[model samples]
Target: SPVAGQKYDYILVGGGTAACVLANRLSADGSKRVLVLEAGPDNTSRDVKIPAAITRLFRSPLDWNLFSELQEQLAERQIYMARGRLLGGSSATNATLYHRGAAGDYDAWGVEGWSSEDVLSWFVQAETNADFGPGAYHGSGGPMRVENPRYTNKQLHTAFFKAAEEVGLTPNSDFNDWSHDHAGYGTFQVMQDKGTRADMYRQYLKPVLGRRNLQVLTGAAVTKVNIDQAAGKAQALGVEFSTDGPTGERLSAELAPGGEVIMCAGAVHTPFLLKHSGVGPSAELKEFGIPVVSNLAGVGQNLQDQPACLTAAPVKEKYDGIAISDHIYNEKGQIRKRAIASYLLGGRGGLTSTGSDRGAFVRTAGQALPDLQVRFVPGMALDPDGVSTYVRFAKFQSQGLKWPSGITMQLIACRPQSTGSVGLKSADPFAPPKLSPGYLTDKDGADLATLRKGIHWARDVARSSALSEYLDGELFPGSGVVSDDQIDEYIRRSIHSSNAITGTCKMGNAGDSSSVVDNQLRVHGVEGLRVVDASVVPKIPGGQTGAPVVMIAERAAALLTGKATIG
Candidate 1:
């Protein structure tokens, strides 16, 4: 199904976070003719641009809506996992918080080209730090702008920090400075350009839209990678895709002879795409009656995620319940019902706030690196007493979305020992892959145990004298829930996904049985095929994965075009 008329130097399968980076870098010089195919539209709506309005974008048409495998341990809980369906992918929908996990997480990968030192510089090269001044930890001329929140919820920070310091944790103004185990709390670094969400699309792809050599086809779903095996060494020749939206029609494009086919479809779909194209497990391909082009069994294994537990309590009136609401509510006392026209014209306000901008990265006892993170959100859910409602004005969710009140400390496991997987359901690429995260299923039970410790850490922070002074007792997982068993029960019952799943198509050296790609990110049994996304991460990072994904794209571009350097 190759088009003989047109040819491209490179064919990128997905227009996601990493894909956007690659799009910018690989095509920056405009020498190599590149083609990008995205499954969703180039969403330029209000919800995707504004920061606070991000919550309104979830579960919308922009979301992939993949469902998780039944968690037998959590009441057979099958949740709809949100992955960005359009350009820029999840980065377009994420919290916009920027964090490069601990230095050691990448060094542990056993891949030389990628280590703490090797990848750290790439992060610096990609970020223009507005919060931290000139230092080894940050850079200035990067494409994505990073900054500290202009304003914060005063009451929440005062109490949270008081409790944190009282619990013996040192005060840290920046969690990215992990020299001291990253133990402290302050403002989180966000990916924004003057309070607006600076997603990969905004920073990378959008600016280069006018390039003639770079062709981006939105709303085009890629179904398979055509492999030319008749020549012996299985080479990815082209991609088969179809567009049924405004772009309308089914078509295929072939690579320019020696050109490469880079797959940036993300964790859930990256390997899913490979397996569907007869490049995965031999036995599985045989079951689907598809010819096995490559017999690699690790195409969709070793899945990992930072499963989080949210603990909340009412704001104690005794202390400072900082309801520092500005223009975030309606005239009737609802939160988030602000003057959008005011923000779009006058500058920053409610659209800048995403409930919280403060958090902590803590190193628990005996851990060499920070093993967990604590993020705060005062009003992201919907309940009887909206934390910001009675204290401010009447605000409501637009587009039929919902929000809750009260203060919640989100406990995220920095490194999860438990690993799950993704498998094909019926060999149909359109049919969602059967996803099993295997959370808290570690045989040693370390995953649950570590998460429980994180929960208790939050409890300790909240119960400190300075924080407890403003205390309404714990609401969701109340004080009544004590002991390890009770805490574990609370974790399972109240667990909401942080949605940071990775390592489905893990990378490693030549003989690693669990590796789907070599250290160079090429498929074990194929040529001209590379996976340049979170799926190649042998393990998840210590914090949010957006920056790391961008870093990976930088490395990939350097490797391919020599336009950038790896080290």
Candidate 2:
């Protein structure tokens, strides 16, 4: 399959968050030949550029839109899952909330050179904060732009902060700062540059595209990693990929001579690719007629994701109405009918809003770690199943308008103990894999309890004087479900993933059997092969996954180049 004369020093697969970082750093010297393979196209649309227009990117061509095989824990729903299929990967489609997990999260990795201090430095190195002042905690010169949204409704802001203060939660100005842990209200820091989405591709790759040694190929679906068998150890020689035009016949390409291969195909696809190449559980591989290469049972195991819930109200007055540029809300009201009318006429009103303008990151009672994250959006609508009829409006338009007011409080479990697996539906790489998230399967009993506590906290915030005057009754789970069993059942029926999936190819110390990669991100028992993406994260980061994924890729680049300097 080799092209006789064409060869590259490194081949990076998947142009999502991690691949973007790797491609940029590896080619920075402008001497080594590097090739980046992306399964999707470039993300340059206005919908992706506008902060409020982001949600619409889901299930689109720019999205991988992978669906899970019926999840038993989630009411047997075969939910439609989405991952960014563009150059920036999910970062181009994500909600743009920036958060780094507590220091303890990285310390728990237990890897010799991977303490909290080590990873925190990488986080700082990857960000260029537009709003926050420069300090040791943040960097002034970096590729990625991190800042708060440009527009936020005053009503939603007052209600969020007022209610938080009434409930005894401290108002925090910054969550990324290492010194504080108290709950606070502030504008959410987004991954944006002006009105455009600043994904990894924009920040890291676009500037280096013209380099002589760096070559990027879009619409490339990597089928498998080619490994040599003569050596007792496994190492990727290169990759096999396919390219096809829309509704056209497909053609294939094989890079048998490319030196080392790094799989940045993300958590879901990375393991599926590995299994297809005969590097997973022996029993599982035998079922699909593929020979086992390494018998690594943990190739596609330990999948983890955050689960979310909603609550809302109505407004009393109407204002200028919701718009795409308006990404935040500070007031309350039920204005769905009107907002829909606005969007149908032109993409404006609630259709252009992010649903929630304010967020809170905190730990629920009885949990040793910060297990709960809350988001308050000034609107209410259908459940994840699409059964409800009401539409919640942004607080800004309803401030002086005579209308009912509502708010949706979303509860997310930050660190779930439950684990799941991914297996091939068939030998075909194009076929979807059997993905079971195992949402609330852990016997620890604390995951569900934390979610309920989140609900109670939302109810308390809604009843607070700052919000109660304009609020309506609870709309989501309703007010009648009082029992714990009822709450659990509600969660089972309504819960959904945050798209923050991780831990499939976990990184850890040498003795840890569950670990798929070493601290340096090198695949165990394999040379010339490494994983640089969310799949390699040993534990889920406390907040959104985009920024952290970038941080990991930046660190991986330094490691690979042998230019890494440590304190």
Candidate 3:
């Protein structure tokens, strides 16, 4: 019943975050045949819809559930990297915190066509902000919906804000306001429509599913991008995929005459797919018996992720009522059943919020930009049943620290100087790639220094008079863990990823071996192909990667359809 050879005007691989946007935009023409191939199943899981149940999706069937290789700087620990494998990709599984980051973030990319001013329009075009009406920085009616969380532990969040102000920081409501450096404490906006997760697949592509010009096939794992090099030039023919992983029926989809292939397989897999498709370093490709098409050494290099560490404090007995721990964890540390019912029935409750509702971007130690970010959560993220928001936190159980009813002050190094790489683990298409996230591997020790300052600052906020009555004392890295040496050791032992992975297939000027794509999002040496996703971000942005990724796809769709121009 299936055709072995199918030709489409556009073959978009990996129906993840970017593919959803591309599918909707490209198929809007009604004349172009667009095919989207996703390796995972449908994204209809209720676990994905419930905001507070985000952690439950992490290592479940909907997640890629990959781990990093040894990180030498972080006590040789292998951090878990949770990526969404379903239709909406990580956006469906993420905390749903929506941020365009700072204007300085894009301007720092230093690329010609991609600057703060140039890309702001795309962000405006992709968002439908419910809190902020039409403004220079905010948009009114776009596909992506962003609004305040329906459920937030106001008592705990208010205490965090007061404590931040007591520590000399301001209380700013909007983090997206580019008027000044985003250095204040406030609640975070989330991508939700009436308390339900606003995944890209539903917001951008789902409505257009009935279009005759678009065809989306799930459970099709692509082996490689089929590229023909007949005239000493590389041109993407299409792609070869298996219906059910590596063993199912094999099929090929070609790009019709003027058609093109857009790889939206995200940061991790896009580079892996490219190397397997013979578009990587010549030496590495030869080692795997993979024929070389274009010798782009930067396919898997420049890996960057925000390193985060949390400093939690136990709340006072009287203040336990303010913590959401009871709602998330039962006496046996199991997820309470009522939490699910609350969301499933009323579509509002504690489960409707990510709990990490408030945070701040602080300029610690007179830096030019805010180098550290704080996520103030009202509940303790303890994974008793191994379903915490950050599954990697389960490792902390060995520390012998009792998981108490507390608040979390998770700090992230906003601008990490360290770099990492992703490489082919095996020639097999289904094999997970090896990730060397060289976190804190910077020679200057700058990242570690920043983390140290952040930890001390978090302690200051927890102990400030504003939160003294609310917090009993620091539970993690307790009072004894003083001095720089002890704090440094604590940091190395507990560092984890903020999950904002980017820059593996970085964009840059053409002919630069380190840059995989050009300003137009086209592959450097290949024709009729483009790599559009978080992977193309040349430099990691200062905040969450989701909004930027959607912004990137919005711009890519415009470029492909002649709606926007490159500088």
Candidate 4:
């Protein structure tokens, strides 16, 4: 392996979603030499290959499962933070739900060339949806394969849609289409090629690795971005990194002349990388005994993430006699399951194999925009860790029972007003930062009130005549617990961090002092350096953030290559 002084035309840091895209596009010309530096190893385990098994990657070697210090909001409980550490990064560990946030989200980018229309066009160009028959909103023949789940349980689908309607929400079959302003029921689209997870590394990088111009260095932890002191400019000139694993040997690597550095490291690591590179708040950098390259105070500020919770109930009777494996045997189940199986077996489930089978984008009162998003799964599981046990019980309890069926609800707060921050605990990159995601801090009162309303709405959905025949009762707020305060308390106690961190490296117009990157994704005072991951999103998306991050990467590619310019 090359030492710290070596260089390449393009050095892409972090093997997350954006890095994969950067590596793929920059090397497409077969001329530009691109070097991708990843902090972790290539995750080729079966747990990573199986879509349903992805949840296990949370704290594994492939995951940078950094936990936040105890949060005051959650009664001082430390929250588990999971981020992908390998070649594919978080995309390799995520739920694989493919949702392009509302159209308004893109339009709100406000950066000259980053309008919603422009970004959406890029999204279409980047993805090829196999199920929806491609057109304007979707592409047909792209490297990335997008598809909906194939095996959706009929009863669960009917109950969910009916329940959604019972709550006065529109039943939308397609949330990714141009319009998602209204409430609706829809199947989830995933970035799966067949049954295997089609992460950026697999879809974009692996296929192009044969190109001499592209070099992917796995297990390379970038420590700093060398800045030109005389010129007072921060360039890609070279990166000081540890060549071996985090605990093993250490070395550094430099960038070739005329080479540009793009930090696709992700929300949590990007700002920290900047700070370590002396491109953050001068005071903070000085405190760490690091010289300042650029005093960008917004490096690790503006952090945002949606809060989530799971509610489950047991059925009135047990169906242990029925085989758990045969639960998804019906036509609807067959379709959904087959799609997943096809993807897993052959990597071609098409558009029917996304992560979440169904979802809704909602606008509740007291929110700036649509502030709530919900995803319904057919099975009941306490947590991803004990899913097998939960599935067995769910199958046994729901088999022959007609009066009751096990069900679970996952409620999320989209567009949360609360802001969080990522600051270094120490100067060491190996030491996790102090992540305080001040959940509900900005709009504590409003968020609580909206969540209470959501609980009420969900209860109504469960109690609707269409669902009453199968529901035993409200498992969460229960029959006696009806007060708003009770619901608020329940939410406070039950809500968990969604792990969808963003806005750390906020992008905006040049004058926005708090913005770290300009609309073009270039660091405010740094040249030849760009951030292309979720961290650059000005605000959290209206729905799941995976798809939005992909879109951002696609648009960033266009901007970096000069294929398109900011408006």
Candidate number of the best TM-score: 3
Question: Runs in model 1 with CA error above 4 Å?
Answer: 1-4, 178-180, 245-250, 317-327, 331-342, 345-347, 380-405, 564-567
Q: TM-scores of all models?
A: 0.91, 0.89, 0.94, 0.89
Task: Tell me the tens digit of each residue's lDDT in model 4 across 151-245.
Answer: 55655557778878877887676777776454566677777765567788788887887897777888788887877766655555667788754
RMSD of each: 3.7, 5.0, 3.0, 4.5
| Top-down TM-score ranking | 3, 1, 4, 2
**Worst 10 contiguous positions by lDDT, candidate 3:** 381-390
Q: Locate the minimum summed-lDDT window of 10 residues in model 2.
A: 386-395
| Model 1 TM-score (2 dp) | 0.91
Residue-wise C-alpha lDDT for candidate 3, range 1-567, written one tens digit per residue: 143566788998899989999999999979899999899888888888778667567777888978888777778878778889989888888889887778888888888989999998899889898789988888877899898887766678778888999999988778888876677888889899978999998899888999988999888888899999997799999998998777777688988998899999999999999999999888889989999999988999999998887877778888754677666555445555876677777666677887666898887778767889898877665421113445543233234343467788888887788889888878898899888888888898888888889988998898888788788877666776799999888888788777889999898875576899989998988999999899999878777889999999999999899998988
lDDT of each: 0.76, 0.73, 0.83, 0.71
- What lDDT tens digits, residue by residue, belong to model 2 across residues 133-250? 6786788788999866654556765777789789887777887877776345555677777535677888898888899888888877777787767747676677777765434334
Please estimate how well model 2 matches the true structure, expressed as its whole-model Cα lDDT. 0.73
C-alpha lDDT (0 to 100) for residue 182 of candidate 1: 60
- Which portions of model 3 show Cα errors greater than 4 Å? 1-5, 329-347, 383-403
